[PDB]
Design a protein that fits this description.
Length: 76
């Protein structure tokens, strides 16, 4: 029993900056929700905290879209 999750399989680039905790990570989308008017994503850091993960807004995400992006044989 399943349902289609919120755009899973998509690895994106995520920024998160607060104080010293400023990184730009590669993460996979787990789920997406609308939390108080805005859409927040629950992203899964690839190589980091694998249980709780983190919530970031669309603003802090770099979506795969051609900005001069490679599409030959990594992810066509």
């Amino acid at each position: 029993e399943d349902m289609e999750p919120c755009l899973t399989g998509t690895k994106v680039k995520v920024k998160y900056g607060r104080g010293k905790t400023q990184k730009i990570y590669e993460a996979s989308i787990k789920s997406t929700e609308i939390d108080d008017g805005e859409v927040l994503y629950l992203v899964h850091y690839y190589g980091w905290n694998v249980r709780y993960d983190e919530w970031v807004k669309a603003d802090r995400i770099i979506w795969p879209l051609d900005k001069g992006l490679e599409h030959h044989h990594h992810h066509h």
